[PDB]
Symmetry: D2
Subunit: 116 residues, 4 copies
């Protein structure tokens, strides 16, 4: 599992469940082509986005739908989404975990990168 | 102001100086239209991006060139940039976008005041 | 300044106003001696804690009463407070302790400038 | 496992390994009594600090030795430690994960609290 996403809610102190996540990859013509998407599970994790074969080198964007998340909770948040953009696999395959910590007017994101 | 950006560097414990910031406004076609840009000053701040008259309700993206910043310091970065996307909605409001940068992590916060 | 504290609220997107802050200096016995305190102002800032003459090298703790702050807003908190512990070491330096508060998370950063 | 601690390094994008963690509990006389301690593993996690029987209600302090961590890496950090203080189990037993994200001049900490 070369790409995983973990989302936490800093208001409730809990995993962020049913958060939509969309991954794009930058194409040769400099547009964003859809790559993979999914939703977080009860533990706030999203596995199985992609495979070692599909996850080639590239510039990737992970768009986490934080606005829908807050609105489902009856909250009016500031950000449209949390977008995380990075070059992947440039020095060979790595495993990437993208973590995001959500508040209504703030987010943080961290990358953990390991060598499989 | 109506819009300010503040950037801090969590590795050196200092304002992030000379960071490029570009602001885009979403156009009718779902594409991103340049709107304002500049470079943070010694205190890590960028004022004067826009004016009350120009800054209408809409969806804005603020893209902070964190990769160039870390390269300039000889520090190896993860992200291409940090992009902060939000809807501006109109009582009297001023927006400050604050960002805290590490090579493999960033946080951003909106401070919205009257 | 020599020592300033800045506090932001990530839930409401605003400066954290009227937050109690206590600063302690570590004494010879490994105990914490009160040193300075105050309440953040409208812009979420607390200036005037100490003076150049008073603020000597040593180990300091800044304890921000986040629990009282969230209670005052009717928001349920996790932490008792946020305590930021650091050694001050003397070229010319000013320290700003910045904190960003959520009910179950906080971040703190030191901004050390000349 | 009612109390777990996870530590990440935001400079390297990696788990923070061999980080000392000390837990204290506030005593009846208002002093901090030692409670449990340990070191993070390769994944940056510290399990087995305590048990359901030992982890009673109380005010707890988790002191993460972030200064030693940075110094071992040849880095001079700002903070002495990252200390996280909280009331536990007040409405019955919970499972607590205390996560910390480390930079040389900054840290963040988050609590994830679940109902076992
Ligand atoms: Ca390559
Ligand atoms: Ca409106
Ligand atoms: Ca010295
Ligand atoms: Ca009780």
């Amino acid at each position: 599992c070369p790409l995983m996403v973990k989302v936490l809610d800093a208001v409730r102190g809990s995993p962020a469940i049913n958060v939509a996540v969309h991954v794009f990859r930058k194409a040769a013509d400099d547009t964003w082509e859809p790559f993979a998407s999914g939703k977080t599970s009860e533990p706030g994790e999203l596995h199985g986005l992609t495979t070692e074969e599909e996850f080639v080198e590239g510039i990737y964007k992970v768009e986490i739908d934080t606005k829908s998340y807050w609105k489902a909770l009856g909250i009016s948040p500031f950000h449209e989404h949390a977008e995380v953009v990075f070059t992947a696999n440039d020095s060979g395959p790595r495993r990437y975990t993208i973590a995001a910590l959500l508040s209504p007017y703030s987010y943080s994101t961290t990358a953990v990168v390991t060598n499989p």
